[PDB]
DNA sequence: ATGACAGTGCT
DNA sequence: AGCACTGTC
């Protein structure tokens, strides 16, 4: 009734750079622009691993995870850009620096949470209030929303994509100006206007295109972002949620794409997010735990409270390398050389981080994987990170893992190592 | 023989 | 603290 919270208190956006690593390489090499293109990591084994794919290449069936030799079978004209290799390993510095470019532009408009190297959540609630004052009750023109889709529209009583988009936007804005929508709907709409301006600034100032979702919380904003790509943005209103969720597979909602989502499907015998509304909160808690149950109860009604955290910078700075199949590290000299390679990249990134961001890491996490273990990590151990010195970090890492060598000799390493991982964590102001 | 990243939550 | 889980390009 009048005491039922509807989760309409915030305006939240999720901005996602379209096939980001590809765009970085296309900006640098114009010959790659507007072509089927992919970014490949390494090159010797089966042509290298594809890690990013342009939308033109996706139309041929090229996907991430694919071996480049296989991608070329689907797309013979596929162009490839190679990830930089330094100290024997893939080095993602170019993409990290490009991400900083975008995040600094986004930070001019609103509070941002860096979700990944190319996604940020945006809390627009305050900016929308400000913009609503300036407008002075003047209606919002469709020209302010030139790339916005309104999910669920058009409805009721053109066979072209852009024409559908405009029809839906007109229906939305017409009902807005007649006062047939709600005050949260107006807030979302102003939020979308700001996101158009943010995306325009990103493209003008970096060359990069992005897509975005605008809704009342992070889960709906992320879901919204994926509905119309590339280079478009989608507004998911609270009212659109029942129809949207009625055929939405549970795995599409963030945090339900793995084992928990699979258990929701199996235990409850349902397929779609909207089907969750038929269970009580206590029922859901009894199957999935207190926290998950409460979260699911609210989420299937379009409600989520997870805040956009004010976090511009990554919380960890890590370096890793796999050694699959025959390349597994089988000797002590190997392990120490590679630990040094990883530690040297980490030292370089850590020193740069300290200069730019006035912070120092205090913990070094060391993880390895041994040949045979089905889990991605076999062992994780931490030690103090007291100096940004690669030779010290590599020695400390060796010290904390050396006991895992169950081999007879000190010169051999068994069972061989299929992964080394160093991660600097626990940052303090400096 | 996807890799190389990253953040959150459990116990 | 060490690990499992979930997500990114």
Swiss-Prot record:
Q: State where Mn(2+) 1 binds.
A: 16-17, 118
Keyword list (alphabetical) reads: Disease variant, DNA damage, DNA repair, DNA replication, DNA synthesis, DNA-binding, DNA-directed DNA polymerase, Isopeptide bond, Magnesium, Metal-binding, Mutator protein, Nucleotidyltransferase, Nucleus, Schiff base, Transferase, Ubl conjugation, Xeroderma pigmentosum, Zinc, Zinc-finger
Q: Where does Mn(2+) 2 bind?
A: 16, 118-119
Q: Specify the effect of residue 156 to D.
A: In a breast cancer sample; somatic mutation
Q: Which cofactor does it need?
A: Mg(2+); Mn(2+)
Which part of the chain is the UmuC domain? 12-257
Q: How is its activity regulated?
A: The enzyme in complex with the DNA substrate binds a third divalent metal cation. The binding of this third divalent cation, which is coordinated by water molecules and two oxygen atoms from DNA and dNTP, is essential for catalyzing the DNA synthesis.
Recount the PTM note: Monoubiquitinated by RCHY1/PIRH2. Ubiquitination depends on integrity of the UBZ3-type zinc finger domain and is enhanced by TRAIP. Ubiquitination inhibits the ability of PolH to interact with PCNA and to bypass UV-induced lesions.
Instruction: Provide the Gene Ontology terms for cellular component.
Output: cytosol; nucleoplasm; nucleus; replication fork; site of double-strand break
Keyword field contains Cell membrane: no
The UniProt record lists the keyword NAD: no
One GO term of the biological process aspect: error-free translesion synthesis
Q: Where found in the cell? A: Nucleus
Primary residence: nucleus
Give the domain of life: Eukaryota
Q: Which residues take part in binding Mg(2+) 1?
A: 16-17, 118
Q: Where does a 2'-deoxyribonucleoside 5'-triphosphate bind?
A: 64
Single GO MF annotation? DNA-directed DNA polymerase activity
Chain residues that bind Mg(2+) 2: 16, 118-119
Upon changing residue 55 to E, the result is:
Reduces DNA polymerase activity. Increases fidelity of replication and reduces translesion bypass
Q: What is the effect of changing residue 189 to P?
A: In XPV; likely pathogenic; loss of DNA-directed DNA polymerase activity; loss of function in translesion synthesis
Report the sequence similarity comment from the record.
Answer: Belongs to the DNA polymerase type-Y family.
Q: What does this protein do?
A: DNA polymerase specifically involved in the DNA repair by translesion synthesis (TLS). Due to low processivity on both damaged and normal DNA, cooperates with the heterotetrameric (REV3L, REV7, POLD2 and POLD3) POLZ complex for complete bypass of DNA lesions. Inserts one or 2 nucleotide(s) opposite the lesion, the primer is further extended by the tetrameric POLZ complex. In the case of 1,2-intrastrand d(GpG)-cisplatin cross-link, inserts dCTP opposite the 3' guanine. Particularly important for the repair of UV-induced pyrimidine dimers.
What does the entry's free-text domain comment contain?
The catalytic core consists of fingers, palm and thumb subdomains, but the fingers and thumb subdomains are much smaller than in high-fidelity polymerases; residues from five sequence motifs of the Y-family cluster around an active site cleft that can accommodate DNA and nucleotide substrates with relaxed geometric constraints, with consequently higher rates of misincorporation and low processivity.
Subunit composition and interactions: Interacts with REV1. Interacts with monoubiquitinated PCNA, but not unmodified PCNA. Interacts with POLI; this interaction targets POLI to the replication machinery. Interacts with PALB2 and BRCA2; the interactions are direct and are required to sustain the recruitment of POLH at blocked replication forks and to stimulate POLH-dependent DNA synthesis on D loop substrates. Interacts (via C-terminus) with TRAIP. Interacts with ubiquitin. Interacts with POLDIP2.
Q: What is this protein called?
A: DNA polymerase eta
What is the organism field in this record? Homo sapiens (Human)
> The organism's lineage?
Eukaryota, Metazoa, Chordata, Craniata, Vertebrata
What is this protein's gene name? Answer: POLH
- Tell me the stretch of the parent sequence this chain holds: 1 to 432 of 713
């Amino acid at each position: 009734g009048p005491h039922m919270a509807t989760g309409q208190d915030r305006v939240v956006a999720l901005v996602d750079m379209d096939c980001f690593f590809v765009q970085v390489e296309q900006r640098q090499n114009p010959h790659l622009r507007n072509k089927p293109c992919a970014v490949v990591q390494y090159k010797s084994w089966k042509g290298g691993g594809i890690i990013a794919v342009s939308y033109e290449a996706r139309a041929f069936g090229v996907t991430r995870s694919m071996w480049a030799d296989d991608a070329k079978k689907l797309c013979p004209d596929l162009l490839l850009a190679q990830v930089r290799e330094s100290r024997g390993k893939a080095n993602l510095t170019k993409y990290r620096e490009a991400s900083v470019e975008v995040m600094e532009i986004m930070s001019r408009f609103a509070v941002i949470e860096r979700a990944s190297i190319d996604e940020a959540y945006v809390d627009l609630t305050s900016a929308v209030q400000e913009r609503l004052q300036k407008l002075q009750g003047q209606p919002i023109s469709a020209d302010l929303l030139p790339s916005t889709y309104i999910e669920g529209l058009p409805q009721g009583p053109t066979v072209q994509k852009e024409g559908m988009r405009k029809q839906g936007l007109f229906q939305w804005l017409d009902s807005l100006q007649i006062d047939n929508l709600t005050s949260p709907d107006l807030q979302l709409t102003v939020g979308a206007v700001i996101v158009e301006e943010m995306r325009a600034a990103i493209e003008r100032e970096t060359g990069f295109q992005c897509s975005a979702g605008i809704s009342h919380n992070k889960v709906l904003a992320k879901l919204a972002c994926g509905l119309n790509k590339p280079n478009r943005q989608t507004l998911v209103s609270h009212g659109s949620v029942p129809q949207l969720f009625s055929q939405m597979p549970i795995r599409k909602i963030r945090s339900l794409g793995g084992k928990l989502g699979a258990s929701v499907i199996e235990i409850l015998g349902i397929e779609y997010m909207g089907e969750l509304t038929q269970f009580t909160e206590s029922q859901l808690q009894s199957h999935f735990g207190e926290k998950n149950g409460s979260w699911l109860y609210a989420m299937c009604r379009g409600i989520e409270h997870d805040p956009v955290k004010p976090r511009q910078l990554p919380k960890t700075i890590g370096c890793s390398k796999n050694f699959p199949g025959k390349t597994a590290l089988a000797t002590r000299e190997q392990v120490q050389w590679w630990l040094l390679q990883l530690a040297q990249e980490l030292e370089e990134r850590l020193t740069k981080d300290r200069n730019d961001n006035d912070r120092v890491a205090t913990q070094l996490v060391v993880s390895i994987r041994v040949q045979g273990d089905k889990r991605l990590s076999s062992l994780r151990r931490c030690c103090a990170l007291t100096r940004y010195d690669a030779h010290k970090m590599s020695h400390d890492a060796f010290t904390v893992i050396k006991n895992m060598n169950t081999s007879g000799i000190q010169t051999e390493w068994s069972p061989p190592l299929t992964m080394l991982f160093l991660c600097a964590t626990k940052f303090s102001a400096s």
